[PDB]
Ligand binder design. Structure first.
Ligand code: FMN
Ligand code: FMN
Lengths: 106, 104
């Protein structure tokens, strides 16, 4: 099961929804992540150039796929196969972003 | 502002999330729609051909846009400029569907 996050499009893309697999993968309950930017999943071993490519894609509302080192709540690393896409209305306004997280550590 | 719905991919695509604008447009609170298929928004004057196109698109996980007649909680009809797309993982498994609703 892949984790899924939904964020607001604007401000700092706060998380507005996670699926159950999100909590299985990351160790966080919904109430611990709602209203936060997903960057709290990163740590000192996360690749800064990868974070930069996500930052620039989100600012432009461009879809992006990266493999990124992330951390469970208890501190265990997992390699996150992350896919992020904007949700657009028919005028092209960005309504939200959706993220799909696959734990590809094994 | 455009309404947004997120559903599960499987079974009968039950609604798992709605934004604030969904409630403004439809007059339903989240508690009233969570766990339900969004077809409850349709009613007597809804075009059956339009429903059938949405049904086939969801079954194949194909993106689709339709203008569909829907009904607010209080029974007032409204034109829903609806666009539906699947959310996929990187192996192409469908994880969810996203619907965007504009009252036109
Ligand atoms: C919908 C969505 C989901 C995201 N999921 C993750 C994630 O699972 N792991 C992660 O490291 N970053 C994730 N991000 C990226 C961070 O939120 C952030 O955009 C990234 O760290 C780049 O921005 P920054 O330099 O301001 O931190 C996600 C962003 C969005 C919009
Ligand atoms: C994410 C999502 C959002 C939807 N939103 C609406 C909507 O706003 N109004 C509507 O009439 N149908 C909506 N539908 C369509 C119905 O849920 C259903 O797929 C359609 O009526 C055709 O299938 P049926 O013949 O089994 O009812 C949505 C479906 C999905 C998957």
């Amino acid at each position: 099961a892949s984790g899924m996050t939904v964020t607001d499009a604007g401000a700092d893309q706060p998380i507005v929804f996670v699926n159950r697999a999100f909590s299985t993968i990351t160790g966080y309950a919904p109430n611990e992540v709602l209203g936060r930017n997903a960057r709290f999943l990163q740590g000192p071993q996360t690749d800064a150039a990868t974070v930069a490519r996500l930052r620039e894609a989100i600012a432009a509302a461009r879809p992006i796929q990266e493999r990124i080192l992330n951390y469970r709540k208890d501190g265990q690393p997992f390699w996150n196969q992350l896919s992020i896409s904007p949700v657009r209305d028919e005028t092209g306004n960005v309504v939200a972003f959706v993220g799909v997280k696959t734990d590809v550590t094994a």
